[PDB]
């Protein structure tokens, strides 16, 4: 015979949704207004072009 789990304990505490809106970068304080920058597919902002191409790791498991 034998047993197992098969069991996905999940449980975390966050906030809902986000007040405000930063670089996915550097993380600053976008100013209400500037312009941002999103890449396709994707929910993530950015300050600059600096940053969106900063933020690109490579391949890793992605
Ligand atoms: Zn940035």
């Given at each position: 015979?034998?047993?197992?789990?098969?069991?996905?304990?999940?449980?975390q505490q966050q906030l809902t949704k986000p007040a405000?809106?930063?670089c996915a970068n550097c993380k600053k304080p976008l100013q209400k207004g500037q312009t941002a920058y999103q890449r396709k597919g994707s929910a993530h902002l950015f300050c600059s072009t600096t940053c969106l191409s900063s933020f690109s790791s490579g391949p890793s498991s992605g």
């Open positions: 015979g034998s047993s197992g789990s098969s069991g996905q304990p999940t449980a405000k809106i930063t």
